[PDB]
RNA sequence: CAUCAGACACCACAAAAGGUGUUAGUUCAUCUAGACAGCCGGACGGUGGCCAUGGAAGUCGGAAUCCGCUAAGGAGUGUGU
């Protein structure tokens, strides 16, 4: 019991991120290029997967 | 007690800024910026000092603190 | 005297009213039989705007234009057995879908009778509404009787 | 048909200016589709409500300096979430219908224009 | 393309006075004083009047123009911080173990002590930076409030308090415990 | 601007594929006929449309994919139940 008004905030900080494909790096949920240089600033992104 | 933003009083290029030519055939004479072409070239003529109207670089000339 | 307003729904003859009408001082089983006197023509799925005032169930019937177009259609079914869709396409009613749809409280903000007669005459997706044509492409040709209802 | 729709807007604004003489600019902000629908149904007799792009109205009045230049006194008042009411009733009845009806807890009239002049009404 | 001049206009309210000598920027007003060293950015300030200061970059590239606009935002942030302030309402998020937070003074540093996070036995301690104060709100359960003048101090101490409670070797999206920044507002209660 | 810079034949190496790094360009469209972005508000009615009826109203599912008001609102983008 985390009272989901709070759990939406924790999911803003932990769940609503996108993830780069090549370098697995956590990203802002509306980004278009991964910020890292080791993946080459690629534009291949996916959502971080929700629970169940 | 006010805003103490200081100056940085540059001397600006403008139409009619008078300039001192140092390198070339004119070699230390006065002329005036007629119309500035672009970021680095100006257009000058110093007709009393004898130097003809010419496009010239801003490396070959130095801005003087006088204007008209 | 108090004010209670509910929206009863599609039922065959006497077809969960108790959960919506317990706090309005009315019945549950007698209120299910109280809506049978209105939706009994009218054997098509519609709504009923019930207005109960603190001591009795007084259900009224809301005028529905899609149910009025379904009242100008084929009624044949009884209950729970038509085995495919329980649907039926039927007769045209080229002028009967222009008087009844323009008399169902003049909905959709119509400024003409060809407006409501196309809004509730071209939304037919269960009936054909024509003898040699179809619906939803007769709105640009329905230009008759506009001055009569207005 | 954006060129077509905008030319249609020019044409209908030229139409509704040169057919009506009583203008009511209304300060209608954040008004719902339920309030406006009962404005569309109520005003079927005398008034014509016209919302839309007030900065498309800017060029619409810019091009209409030649014909009836007395509409030059409107573009300082087209600022704010305003709309047009086109009728021939001069002051009273339209201002009594717009402001008083359909209020809950913005429908006012901010400008009244009759044949060239402006009136507080 | 080498933009010939770009400029921004910093609005200055009544109660603050600024003081820019070459790029040291002092801003003094009704809550305190803020100073920011901007020697690394090469922009040109010009007072047009007491309420408006135009910053400008002459003959700059692209990154140089980006530096200009962020100079404007930095000066505006100091100005709104010394007029209004900043106030970050962080709120505790715990699953089963009630996170206990105190302030301790040790060697005059005023650490924020985080106890019993996830049922750990490790006592965490965060140094409170200079310029930020920490309160615990009335009649809203499990909240901490960090209010100060600088954006950088308040925000960086909020991030220190958040990220000292990262959950290790677990599924982070199941174990959501931590102290998370909820509201980012101003000290002045009218706004 | 390179938290593996690059540097002039033969000659002592580098590719496909990517980059909202940054400069230049091509085509088309919106473009001033005040757009884009953002903030404030609507996001209608026919309609719980036809239905499979414990329940389906945009939303476990299927097909038609309409009209009026419009300045604009989908027989609805997800959630909820």
């Amino acid at each position: 019991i985390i009272e989901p008004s709070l759990k939406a905030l924790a999911s803003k900080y932990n769940c609503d991120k996108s993830v780069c494909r090549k370098c697995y790096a956590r990203l802002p949920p509306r980004a278009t290029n991964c910020r890292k240089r080791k993946c080459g600033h690629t534009n291949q992104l996916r959502p971080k997967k929700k629970l169940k | 007690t006010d805003s103490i933003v200081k100056a940085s009083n540059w001397r600006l290029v403008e139409v009619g800024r008078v300039v001192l030519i140092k390198k070339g055939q004119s070699a230390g004479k006065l002329a005036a910026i007629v119309e500035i072409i672009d970021q680095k070239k100006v257009l000058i003529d110093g007709p009393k000092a004898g130097v003809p109207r010419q496009a010239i670089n801003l490396g070959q000339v130095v801005l003087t603190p006088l204007t008209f | 005297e108090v004010k209670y307003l509910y929206l009863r729904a599609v039922g065959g003859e006497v077809g969960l009213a108790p959960k919506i009408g317990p706090l309005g001082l009315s019945p549950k089983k007698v209120g299910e039989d109280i809506a049978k006197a209105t939706k009994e023509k009218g054997i098509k799925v519609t709504v009923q705007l019930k207005i109960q005032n603190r001591q009795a169930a007084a259900s009224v019937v809301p005028s529905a234009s899609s149910l009025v177009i379904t009242a100008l259609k084929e009624p044949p079914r009884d209950r729970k057995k038509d085995k495919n869709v329980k649907h039926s396409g039927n007769i045209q009613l080229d002028e009967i879908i222009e008087i009844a749809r323009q008399m169902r409280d003049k909905s959709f903000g119509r400024t003409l009778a060809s407006v409501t007669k196309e809004i509730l005459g071209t939304a037919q997706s269960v009936g054909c509404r024509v003898d040699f044509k179809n619906p939803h492409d007769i709105i640009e040709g329905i230009n008759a009787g506009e001055i009569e209802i207005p | 048909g954006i060129r077509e729709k905008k030319a249609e807007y020019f044409a209908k604004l030229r139409e509704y200016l040169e057919e009506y003489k009583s203008l009511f600019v209304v300060g209608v902000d954040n008004v719902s589709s339920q309030q406006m629908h009962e404005v569309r149904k109520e005003l079927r007799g005398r008034a014509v409500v016209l919302m839309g792009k007030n900065t498309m109205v800017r060029r619409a009045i810019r091009g209409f300096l030649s014909d009836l230049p007395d509409f030059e006194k409107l573009l300082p008042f087209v600022k704010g979430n305003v709309g047009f009411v086109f009728t021939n009733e001069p002051l009273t009845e339209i201002k009594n219908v717009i402001v008083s009806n359909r209020v809950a807890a913005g429908l006012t009239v901010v400008q009244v224009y009759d044949n060239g002049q402006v009136f507080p009404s | 393309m080498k933009y010939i001049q770009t400029e921004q206009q910093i609005e200055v309210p009544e109660g603050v006075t600024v003081s820019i000598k070459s790029r040291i920027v002092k801003v003094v007003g009704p809550r305190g004083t803020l100073t920011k060293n901007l020697k690394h950015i090469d922009v040109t300030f010009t007072k047009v009047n007491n309420q408006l200061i135009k910053v400008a970059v002459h003959n700059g590239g692209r990154k140089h123009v980006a530096a200009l606009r962020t100079v404007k935002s930095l000066v505006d942030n100091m100005i709104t911080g010394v007029t209004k302030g900043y106030k970050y309402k962080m709120r505790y998020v715990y699953a089963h173990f009630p996170i206990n937070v105190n302030i301790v003074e040790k060697d005059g540093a005023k650490f924020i002590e985080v106890r019993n996070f996830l049922g750990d036995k490790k006592i965490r301690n965060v140094p409170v930076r200079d310029g930020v104060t920490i309160e615990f709100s009335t009649n809203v359960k499990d909240e901490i409030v960090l209010s100060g003048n600088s954006v950088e101090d308040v925000s960086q101490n909020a991030a220190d308090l958040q990220q000292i409670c990262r959950v290790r070797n677990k599924d982070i999206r199941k174990f959501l415990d931590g102290i998370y920044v909820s509201h980012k507002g101003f000290i002045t209660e009218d706004l």
Side-chain angles (χ1 to χ4, degrees), chain A, chain B, chain C residues 9 11-12 15 17-18 21-22 24 27 31 35 37 42 56-58 62 64 71 75-76 89 100 109 113 121 123 127 135 141 144-145 150, chain D residues 1-120, chain E:
Chain A
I1 297 95
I2 302 173
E3 183 59 34
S5 67
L6 292 177
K7 190 170 78 71
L9 168 140
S11 299
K12 178 197 288 186
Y13 287 159
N14 289 316
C15 298
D16 290 332
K17 298 284 187 181
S18 73
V19 180
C20 181
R21 290 283 172 88
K22 300 167 70 176
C23 71
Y24 297 89
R26 195 184 295 179
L27 286 180
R30 291 182 297 274
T32 50
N33 296 114
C34 179
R35 60 167 60 94
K36 309 296 182 183
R37 191 173 61 87
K38 68 179 191 176
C39 66
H41 304 303
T42 188
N43 53 6
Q44 295 181 356
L45 309 177
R46 67 176 180 87
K48 184 173 172 64
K49 291 191 177 181
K50 309 294 191 293
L51 276 175
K52 67 185 179 180
Chain B
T1 61
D2 286 325
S3 304
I4 317 297
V5 180
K6 188 176 168 58
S8 183
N9 190 2
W10 284 281
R11 64 181 73 98
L12 305 171
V13 306
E14 68 184 4
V15 175
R17 168 72 65 184
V18 55
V19 295
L20 182 64
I21 299 168
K22 66 178 184 288
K23 291 190 285 288
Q25 302 176 357
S26 303
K29 291 180 181 177
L30 293 178
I33 297 173
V34 178
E35 181 176 1
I36 179 151
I37 297 172
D38 51 351
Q39 194 62 250
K40 293 179 187 292
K41 290 186 174 64
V42 300
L43 181 65
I44 57 170
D45 186 70
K48 286 186 69 66
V51 43
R53 175 187 291 273
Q54 56 192 1
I56 209 161
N57 197 1
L58 283 174
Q60 295 179 357
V61 78
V62 59
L63 297 179
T64 70
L66 304 176
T67 63
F68 73 107
Chain D
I2 304 299
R3 297 289 89 192
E4 290 292 327
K5 181 64 71 177
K6 287 183 181 181
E8 182 179 2
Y9 190 81
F10 284 117
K12 69 181 181 181
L13 196 144
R14 185 176 292 173
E15 181 179 1
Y16 287 115
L17 286 179
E18 293 179 353
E19 291 294 326
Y20 294 98
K21 292 181 181 180
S22 296
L23 172 61
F24 291 96
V25 176
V26 292
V28 283
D29 196 0
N30 300 326
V31 181
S32 65
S33 296
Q34 186 60 255
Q35 295 182 358
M36 290 301 291
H37 189 74
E38 293 180 353
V39 171
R40 296 285 187 183
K41 292 188 290 186
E42 185 179 1
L43 293 177
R44 300 291 182 184
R46 295 298 303 274
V48 174
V49 63
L50 193 278
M51 296 297 293
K53 186 176 178 181
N54 287 317
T55 63
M56 190 69 201
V57 171
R58 285 180 182 179
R59 181 60 175 88
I61 297 175
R62 286 172 187 170
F64 292 168
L65 269 298
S66 298
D67 48 351
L68 293 172
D70 293 331
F71 295 95
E72 193 178 1
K73 292 172 70 175
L74 199 276
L75 289 178
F77 301 101
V78 79
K79 186 261 190 292
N81 203 351
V82 300
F84 295 100
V85 173
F86 294 146
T87 184
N88 291 318
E89 295 178 354
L91 278 76
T92 62
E93 295 179 354
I94 303 298
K95 191 261 189 295
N96 291 318
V97 169
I98 293 171
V99 179
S100 178
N101 194 0
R102 192 66 183 88
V103 65
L107 298 179
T108 58
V109 173
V110 299
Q111 293 295 318
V112 177
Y113 179 81
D114 289 330
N115 292 317
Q117 293 180 356
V118 294
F119 295 97
Chain E
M1 63 178 288
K2 289 189 179 295
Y3 295 90
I4 190 167
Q5 58 177 353
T6 59
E7 68 184 5
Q8 295 297 317
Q9 291 177 353
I10 304 167
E11 178 183 358
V12 176
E14 291 87 1
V16 295
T17 59
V18 309
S19 298
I20 291 94
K21 196 180 178 183
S22 66
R23 260 83 49 83
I24 303 298
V25 179
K26 189 192 286 184
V27 173
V28 179
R31 191 169 290 275
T33 68
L34 291 175
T35 57
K36 187 165 290 296
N37 188 357
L38 300 178
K39 286 184 186 294
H40 56 85
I41 208 147
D42 279 334
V43 301
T44 300
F45 292 84
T46 298
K47 176 177 181 176
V48 66
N49 48 2
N50 276 317
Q51 283 77 14
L52 289 174
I53 302 165
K54 288 187 287 185
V55 311
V57 162
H58 305 92
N59 201 359
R62 183 179 176 87
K63 302 291 187 69
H64 202 184
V65 177
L68 167 139
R69 172 69 183 180
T70 189
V71 160
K72 174 187 182 292
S73 293
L74 291 181
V75 180
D76 280 330
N77 282 316
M78 282 195 291
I79 283 176
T80 61
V82 77
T83 56
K84 299 177 183 177
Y86 296 101
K87 189 170 185 177
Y88 287 177
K89 291 181 176 181
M90 301 173 69
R91 194 166 297 113
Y92 306 155
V93 176
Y94 67 95
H96 183 271
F97 292 102
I99 300 167
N100 194 1
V101 178
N102 294 317
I103 298 170
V104 295
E105 180 176 359
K106 183 178 182 294
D107 291 333
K110 294 169 67 68
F111 294 102
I112 290 172
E113 179 182 6
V114 179
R115 285 179 177 270
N116 204 3
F117 175 71
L118 289 174
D120 289 334
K121 309 301 286 184
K122 174 184 169 67
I123 287 172
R124 303 176 197 268
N125 289 114
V126 183
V128 169
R129 301 187 190 275
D130 292 334
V132 60
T133 65
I134 284 91
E135 296 179 354
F136 300 100
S137 178
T138 308
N139 69 19
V140 176
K141 182 177 181 292
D142 291 328
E143 189 181 5
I144 184 170
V145 170
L146 281 76
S147 66
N149 306 330
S150 175
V151 200
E152 292 172 349
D153 286 327
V154 175
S155 68
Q156 184 60 47
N157 199 3
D160 274 334
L161 213 154
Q162 174 179 1
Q163 296 180 355
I164 206 67
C165 296
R166 286 193 294 262
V167 178
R168 296 182 66 194
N169 304 324
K170 304 293 186 291
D171 195 356
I172 57 101
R173 67 182 190 267
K174 175 65 176 64
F175 297 96
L176 290 168
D177 295 339
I179 296 168
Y180 296 138
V181 177
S182 70
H183 176 267
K184 292 186 178 184
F186 302 107
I187 297 174
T188 63
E189 298 292 328
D190 56 355
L191 294 174

